[PDB]
Amino acid sequence: TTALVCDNGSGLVKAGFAGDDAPRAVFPSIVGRPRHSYVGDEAQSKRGILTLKYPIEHGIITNWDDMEKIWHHTFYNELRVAPEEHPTLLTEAPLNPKANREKMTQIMFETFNVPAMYVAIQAVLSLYASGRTTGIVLDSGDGVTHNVPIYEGYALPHAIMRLDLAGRDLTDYLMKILTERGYSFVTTAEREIVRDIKEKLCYVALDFENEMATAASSSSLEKSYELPDGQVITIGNERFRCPETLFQPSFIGMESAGIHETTYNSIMKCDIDIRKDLYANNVMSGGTTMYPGIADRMQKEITALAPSTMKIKIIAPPERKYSVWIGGSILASLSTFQQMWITKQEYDEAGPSIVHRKCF
Amino acid sequence: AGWNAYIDNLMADGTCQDAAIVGYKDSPSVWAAVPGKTFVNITPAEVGVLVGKDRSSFYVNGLTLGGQKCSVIRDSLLQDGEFSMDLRTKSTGGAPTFNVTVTKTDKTLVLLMGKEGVHGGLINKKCYEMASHLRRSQY
């Protein structure tokens, strides 16, 4: 019978069937209630008249009643499956609290009646999608950025690092600097335009200082963006200042380490004997790692911190916007996974805490 | 019946290649282990690292069990509600590596090593159930 894979993100849910090459459903992680429930696309379309709730904050489920609505919608409306008929693989953020893992397990077995379930760390699934079982993953999404070192499929929690900004923060910063330029973005629709500009026209400069120095004279830097209604926005140095924030969090006022330093700090927390393998298997995942130039810049910066890595290339898979989901589809389709599921019998005997024993 | 029966119980389902019961109170020594394998050779220094106050240095390049180098994956060994640590062995040359769980009872450490390809979750579940039995038995 066919397993399900559901990747629960801060911004986007990706769901589908194990063994498929792509999720069947991708939709916003939002539940909307009136106000005086709608989920996903339909809540988005009616957002003006609803109280919209984002049940997943920085990767962590925080509103269980609304998360149950998201899962019910995923099964019944998007996938059109009876969850009692399908073993279900769910994803979780690195360092997801114990009590949250237990509640997800309880809800799956008691509310949705699944025959079997498993909870996998999102970064571990992206590593598998890249073909590897040992490596370090930089996963940067909408709400959270982590570095997750992994040894033979096991994340190493002591060494997981967090950068306290991700894609939403970058959208906000691009909006700020385009506003300084002279534009105004007051409505929700206008913010979505800025997010699209960010996704289409931004890039990571290899030499940031030189790029700033030469911007005013560049014949190639300025780009224009024309909306369907004929409005035009022009962008210049904001193209590379926006994602520069990943390397220099001071751009949005924070004293935090940038992504090259979190990567280095994470590897240095790991066993001496695995570090070389981590450097050689350093994999980008998540939407916020899609900027052109990110691998070249990471290589440059890591080489400055760890000169032994001069010739080592960063791994930037083309499918990394969906690599978490794809790794889950691969994993749950394999025979090695039959042993890994938590069965209903195991849950009946041990209760929700069984997830602590079985899923790491 | 004695502690060898415990080793038979732990080995019975075919998932593990090695198993041991090691006292860390009253009689500090290997009480039983699978003959000719790795845990039978655990030393008091290695037990000292497992139960010791330093929960950080074993992330420099691991710890050893019977001389076998291992990497720490999760450490909740000294937490009274969890009482477990998960490791995976380290090898050279791309030789296979194996998941290990250690659990802590009132008097013992229970150690289990999976066979090749056996998931760490299965090994943790079995070790935790055995430690839970021993703790219920005042051991």
Add this chain to the structure above:
Amino acid sequence: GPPPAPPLPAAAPGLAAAIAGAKLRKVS
């Protein structure tokens, strides 16, 4: 020497090779 034991309860190719060989299918 160890104390008496209380009674027992009475109630190759590797993972990367399996991953590589997983042939995902188009949707569908």
